[PDB]
Amino acid sequence: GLLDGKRILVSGIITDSSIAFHIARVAQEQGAQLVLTGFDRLRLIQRITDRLPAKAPLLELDVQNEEHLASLAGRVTEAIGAGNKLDGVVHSIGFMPQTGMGINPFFDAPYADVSKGIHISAYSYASMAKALLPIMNPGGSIVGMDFDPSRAMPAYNWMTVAKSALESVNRFVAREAGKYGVRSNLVAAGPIRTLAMSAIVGGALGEEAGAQIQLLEEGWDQRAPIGWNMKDATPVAKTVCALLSDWLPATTGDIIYADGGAHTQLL
Amino acid sequence: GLLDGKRILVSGIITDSSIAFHIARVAQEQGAQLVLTGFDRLRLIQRITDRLPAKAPLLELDVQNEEHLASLAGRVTEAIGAGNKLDGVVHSIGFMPQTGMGINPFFDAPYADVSKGIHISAYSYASMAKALLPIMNPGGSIVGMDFDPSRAMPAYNWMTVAKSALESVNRFVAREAGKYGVRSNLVAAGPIRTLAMSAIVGLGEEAGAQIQLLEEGWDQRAPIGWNMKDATPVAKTVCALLSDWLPATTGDIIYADGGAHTQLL
Amino acid sequence: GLLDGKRILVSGIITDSSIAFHIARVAQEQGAQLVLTGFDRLRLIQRITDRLPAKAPLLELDVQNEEHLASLAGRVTEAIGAGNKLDGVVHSIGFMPQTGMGINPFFDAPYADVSKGIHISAYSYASMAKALLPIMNPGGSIVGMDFDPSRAMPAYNWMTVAKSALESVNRFVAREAGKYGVRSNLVAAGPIRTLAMSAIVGGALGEEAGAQIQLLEEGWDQRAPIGWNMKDATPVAKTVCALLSDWLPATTGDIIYADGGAHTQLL
Amino acid sequence: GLLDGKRILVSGIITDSSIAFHIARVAQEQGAQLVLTGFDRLRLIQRITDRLPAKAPLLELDVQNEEHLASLAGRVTEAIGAGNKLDGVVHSIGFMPQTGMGINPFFDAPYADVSKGIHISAYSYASMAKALLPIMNPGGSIVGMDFDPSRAMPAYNWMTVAKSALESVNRFVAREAGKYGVRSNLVAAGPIRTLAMSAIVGGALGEEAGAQIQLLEEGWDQRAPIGWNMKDATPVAKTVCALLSDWLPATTGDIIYADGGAHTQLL
Numbered sequence A, C, D: 001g002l003l004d005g006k007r008i009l010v011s012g013i014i015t016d017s018s019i020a021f022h023i024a025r026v027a028q029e030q031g032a033q034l035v036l037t038g039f040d041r042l043r044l045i046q047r048i049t050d051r052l053p054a055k056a057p058l059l060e061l062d063v064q065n066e067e068h069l070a071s072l073a074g075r076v077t078e079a080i081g082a083g084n085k086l087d088g089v090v091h092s093i094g095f096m097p098q099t100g101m102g103i104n105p106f107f108d109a110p111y112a113d114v115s116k117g118i119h120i121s122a123y124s125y126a127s128m129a130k131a132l133l134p135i136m137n138p139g140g141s142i143v144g145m146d147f148d149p150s151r152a153m154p155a156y157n158w159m160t161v162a163k164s165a166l167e168s169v170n171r172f173v174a175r176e177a178g179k180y181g182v183r184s185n186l187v188a189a190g191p192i193r194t195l196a197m198s199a200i201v202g203g204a205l206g207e208e209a210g211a212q213i214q215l216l217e218e219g220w221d222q223r224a225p226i227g228w229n230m231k232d233a234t235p236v237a238k239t240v241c242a243l244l245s246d247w248l249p250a251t252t253g254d255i256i257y258a259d260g261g262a263h264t265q266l267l
Numbered sequence B: 001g002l003l004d005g006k007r008i009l010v011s012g013i014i015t016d017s018s019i020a021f022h023i024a025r026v027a028q029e030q031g032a033q034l035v036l037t038g039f040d041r042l043r044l045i046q047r048i049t050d051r052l053p054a055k056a057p058l059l060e061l062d063v064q065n066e067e068h069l070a071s072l073a074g075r076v077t078e079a080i081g082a083g084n085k086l087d088g089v090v091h092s093i094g095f096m097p098q099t100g101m102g103i104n105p106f107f108d109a110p111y112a113d114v115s116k117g118i119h120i121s122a123y124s125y126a127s128m129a130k131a132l133l134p135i136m137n138p139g140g141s142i143v144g145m146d147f148d149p150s151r152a153m154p155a156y157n158w159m160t161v162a163k164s165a166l167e168s169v170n171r172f173v174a175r176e177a178g179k180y181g182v183r184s185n186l187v188a189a190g191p192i193r194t195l196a197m198s199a200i201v202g203l204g205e206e207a208g209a210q211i212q213l214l215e216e217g218w219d220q221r222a223p224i225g226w227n228m229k230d231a232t233p234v235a236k237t238v239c240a241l242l243s244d245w246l247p248a249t250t251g252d253i254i255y256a257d258g259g260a261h262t263q264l265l
Ligand SMILES: NC(=O)c1ccc[n+]([C@@H]2O[C@H](COP(=O)([O-])OP(=O)(O)OC[C@H]3O[C@@H](n4cnc5c(N)ncnc54)[C@H](O)[C@@H]3O)[C@@H](O)[C@H]2O)c1
Pocket: A011, A012, A013, A014, A015, A017, A018, A019, A020, A038, A039, A061, A062, A063, A064, A091, A092, A093, A094, A095, A120, A145, A146, A147, A188, A189, A190, A191, A192, A193, A194, A195, A196
């Protein structure tokens, strides 16, 4: 078992298509003991996580809620037992209001919406690290999910800006985490069909955005030297487990691309 | 005159050490006709801008104020005369509350503070472009100021995050600006002793020494050297982007840092 | 004139479509006094350079010829007069044997061929700097031509590797040039129709390489926020002139992109 | 056993301080069956490989020898048995003549020397993939060693240029390897005390260049959020093994940094 004996917190499960659900599944298959966190729809999330290979405690965490963050470490400790600490933390959380996405003009997104998106998608990586580092073991690993924002693209709009901010946040979280002997890294995944952008991807919220996204997906598989399957989150989940393991011990503040190699190819 | 006959808006002047003051000075020396914008202390800003080579109208602009942004294009047009449009726009605006800077712990900056910083330092680049693109001529140029955030570093903390956001915003503003025949670019400057240098050492008496060490280190790393007391090479670079001489460059970052970012030691 | 009173050496003219021909034309329009260097077909190059706005001396330079490089500074000095130095140098020189490009398999290019391409396309940037720095004025500028090699692509093959090497060479030339108060930079241009790859671009050396290149060009103009005209070298020439001027005085070891903004956009 | 049942070729062992020695040791600890290749000093190499946890066959391979490369796959097959194929290949091979490094001026390295260095350090990554891909299993992995050349630095000089070329070569090897269902990646390590470059360091002793090197090397530990120990190759060896495993299945054409996170930090 790649993660035998390791205690890992996984946030971000909302459906069985969630990248976090697959991370959790693979982690448990590899021997990890999990604590899960969920947002807003905890009754539904509980039914979904009951389908994981092993039973895991589910805790509520809205990353915009200061009370939730202040009590998190205490709640986790109660879940894993006094005297035990975490070895891993997975941040698989993102949101950008519709005004900041799709066919909505880039200039028309009010700052209040953009600010909410950046709070949830980027700042929360730092606040979860702040909350959880005091209960992590040395040798531990924090991993977040990125979508390569180094270039602009249609439809992704303000979420691209939030991911640029997240990459920067990760480099600073690494500085803090290193004081605890903990690594911090992002996995930059290729596009996966999940609930988050399903309405935009399907064309429901503007045919143009749907068409642009189809072009992006087709080009991604084309450019990836080993191809890319947008319906299979397993390669991404495996990569996250690699970073949670002891086998990338000198990598921190960094981004590991689980994208079929697409970002390394122009055409 | 590199910018002869060009009408250019320059934001960001607060003292005669401001990068924006030197941009304005060099632009005027090169024949540009300017409109200036200032934040908050407009009477004091007027006294500062009187030190420029030529007179220029000064307009109030708080980039967090939606009323200011909605009226800006109209106020500019009254300043430059009906029928006339801008050829250039300079965004030289930044702020991050002290909780997000210096020796204050990275984790202790509340989101309200970080969000204000991002609003002023990154989102406002898009806000300005939205307000002014409708009164810009084809061939025009929008330029903002950047400090290379590709790697983390001490003290710069959350402003680094805001600059990472700004670089992303710039790539999207370029998509919009291109529809108008306008380019959008950032100049990533080396460190300059402006009023804002005090923001990164907000420490004790060690501040002066730390700044002196920064200058020593940057000048060593830069293959052509670096003088933190001299904003002129940065100002010239901004003027190059405002000119007709980089006509195929957009969404991009020009480094005016003495070449330091290309060297490891 | 942007370059009034400046003495500038321009290498790399072979036809009137050469990027160097347009650099030369624009520089002369901006008041520069030129010295030109040409390779192999000097009688033909002389006829071509006679069509420039002003007369300029033409010197022979094969960058693989040690005797040519050893005598170059003295020949330039004779051309511009004793007591006078250069303010600028433009390297617009490239070559990669056909085995290293197009439909020819990447693995099948013999090292002898790849080595020749790297010699001419990358090492010679250092060779020319070595020869000419001793006769350059402080405030001077060396500029070479790059095609962004940060990602792999079809057909460009080993020339991509040579450009990666050239970018690295440029960073080291900057260190040396700095001692003389001279800047060194590359301009990464978008694709321009010139003699160099004309046979491959036309499909004459393999239809698939022609097809791949057409796709690359179509995509380039599409992504470029201000568009891209592959038949117009003028924007690239202007950019080189900007770097030769006094207006980018703090930029060195660097790469300026004159590509319509295409490299900043994914799609 | 991370590499249980995998058959892996490891090149580049010359001393028990070689990065390749540590890669081989860790791979064997994780259940891999190895074939080793050595250059020039085969009697010494055999004595050294006797220090590994398990016996592995040693084959001669000079990457500049076309006959060695032509016969390599047949020799490997005889070593692992007909019907069996490789799951992994490690390229841990590098060389740049002294003229191209250290206190020797950058401009004084003759191209003959630079070309040799680029042949061994960059082109041979493609040569080895060409020779071995036909006997690799799908799901397989090729890994090479890189030293981040994105910025210039004192002393490393023309080796930096060779590594820039290598990174470009890796992106093209990934295109070819993908046709076989094989991944290709580099690990960019922080500085390790392997005895490589001892002659370069020795020439720089007490000089400015020597001081520069010590400042540069020690810069990794300063900048690395988790620190960096130049005396310990194990974290690098582990990272290579992670890439050889099934746990980074969507990463190709890419660079993994095993440098303590130093490259993500400016100071
Ligand atoms: N799907 C892709 O193609 C892709 C590619 C690269 C990166 N990512 C990133 O991967 C992560 C997971 O995305 P996904 O595709 O699995 O979509 P998803 O919808 O299945 O998961 C996103 C999660 O964010 C959670 N969330 C939203 N607001 C929250 C809040 N205030 N507090 C706590 N949690 C909150 C949601 O409840 C949900 O569980 C995100 O960071 C996303 O940006 C997705």
